[PDB]
Design a protein around this ligand. Structure first.
Ligand SMILES: CC(C)(O)CCC[C@@H](CC#CC(O)(C(F)(F)F)C(F)(F)F)[C@H]1CC[C@H]2/C(=C/C=C3C[C@@H](O)C[C@H](O)C3)CCC[C@]12C
Ligand SMILES: CC(C)(O)CCC[C@@H](CC#CC(O)(C(F)(F)F)C(F)(F)F)[C@H]1CC[C@H]2/C(=C/C=C3C[C@@H](O)C[C@H](O)C3)CCC[C@]12C
Lengths: 240, 10, 240, 10
């Protein structure tokens, strides 16, 4: 029971990819439309999400085997999983102490209330926080966190995927890497893997609810005009 | 048509 | 030779409209994506222009007779004239002393160089500055400035206009008001009116060049993604 | 189709 010189290369890649597309100082946030605490946080959070999508795309492109999919599959996967990858990667800034995402100073500490100022219900936010708390409680190794993001992105059960035999293959190889990594490198991690797969299940429902909330926003031009072309294109139903 | 996504995907 | 109780009501309306849609403190600019001095000013200037378009729409809706046009005509006029109304209204912030638009502090003082950081050529900017200098030299009364904006918007010679017999009527009434106002209220203004009409001619060419520059930008997704949904819709060729 | 313009024009 020892990782193969191919399983660790996959791990090397995903971890470097994450480092290349995730800044722990959050210094680009000053370039977003500033936060205001009628849907005052919408501009800021739309910018955040748009930016994060760009980052998720950069990451996805570095997932072993992703570049080889058809552009359609790459798109079909990004569109379906974008919000979930975003929810996953945000855990890095999320804080149990204050139950908010802490991206620096008074301005970039996002709490439940801030997101409601962006067209979301206090009600719909409960699960997201709960999910962040459960995910944070797992205390994932960077290897696992980064692996979980890649596995999520390569879910075959996404509307629009064509070659779902091949995405299933890439994801299984990834799942294997993670199971092996946990068994070999993660003491006390006997039941961790399954808790992680459970998280993917939680992501699907969170994705579902968001999609609904987002439709409501995107249908009112006064609100939709606050979005970005990227956000509108990624969360839009335009089908190709 | 996904102008931007296709662009960003290189 | 004395203005009619109807010509002054038109003047009252356009002047109040301008006051309602133009802030001389420029305090909303802090909500734009901040300026950076690869096309670093694009985000800021796109936000500025998007905001200004919103303001131009607010103004247009208060131009006597504009609300009565078909929604198509209103749109056809806004789309064609938007950039020109913007160029006209900016003269208020433009400064002969420094040949820049001065909207407050180091951050919001826009010079020729800043606009080039937004995908425009130093070459294409020459006329805009020249135009601002000529327009500023006219030292227009607020009544005239505001009148000139309304006349520009109701130009009948715009792609897409349907009822160009009726826009011509509204614009002529406006032109009359301005000619009368100048004759009666503007000492030393014998030759001013014609210089103002000449400015409309200058706007057409400036609109033309911008449209070209804008096409170049809007065709590269990496740049187009920096625009706003409003800008993209107003300067887009989508035809209806 | 001009969703936003039509909206903003009241
Ligand atoms: C809770 C839910 C199911 O209802 C969905 C909430 C989704 C979004 C809010 C939104 C939205 C929009 O629908 C958009 F269109 F999608 F935009 C908007 F805005 F309403 F339009 C949530 C998910 C993750 C959250 C956060 C992540 C933090 C990060 C900081 C840092 O860790 C970097 C991470 O990438 C990201 C904090 C803010 C709120 C976020 C971004
Ligand atoms: C010179 C030209 C013919 O090539 C066209 C220049 C047009 C624009 C720049 C642009 C653009 C875009 O093409 C956009 F898409 F259209 F956005 C972008 F950005 F490149 F994409 C010019 C015209 C008036 C100028 C200014 C007005 C100032 C104001 C401040 C204040 O007075 C309020 C006014 O409304 C507005 C200062 C900055 C540069 C402006 C906005």
């Amino acid at each position: 029971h020892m990782l193969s010189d191919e399983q660790m290369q996959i791990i090397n890649s995903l971890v470097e990819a994450h480092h290349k597309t995730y800044d722990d100082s959050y210094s680009d946030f000053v370039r977003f439309r500033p936060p205001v605490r009628r849907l005052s946080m919408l501009p800021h959070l739309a910018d955040l999400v748009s930016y994060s999508i760009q980052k998720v795309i950069g990451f996805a492109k570095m997932i072993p085997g992703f570049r080889d999919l058809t552009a359609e599959d790459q798109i079909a996967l990004l569109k379906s999983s974008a919000i979930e990858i975003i929810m996953l990667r945000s855990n890095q800034s999320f804080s149990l102490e204050d139950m908010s995402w802490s991206c620096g100073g008074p301005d970039f500490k996002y709490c439940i209330n801030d997101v409601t100022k962006a067209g979301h219900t206090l009600e719909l936010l409960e699960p997201l926080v709960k999910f962040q708390v459960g995910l944070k409680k797992l205390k994932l190794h960077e290897e696992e966190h980064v692996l979980l993001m890649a596995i999520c992105l390569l879910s075959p059960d996404r509307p629009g995927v064509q070659d779902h035999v091949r995405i299933e293959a890439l994801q299984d190889r990834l799942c294997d890497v993670l199971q092996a990594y946990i068994r070999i490198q993660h003491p006390g991690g006997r039941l961790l893997y399954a808790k992680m797969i459970q998280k993917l299940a939680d992501l699907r429902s969170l994705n579902e609810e968001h999609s609904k909330q987002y439709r409501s926003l995107s249908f009112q031009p006064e609100h939709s005009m606050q979005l970005t072309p990227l956000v509108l294109e990624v969360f839009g139903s335009e089908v190709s | 048509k996904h102008k931007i996504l296709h662009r960003l995907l290189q």
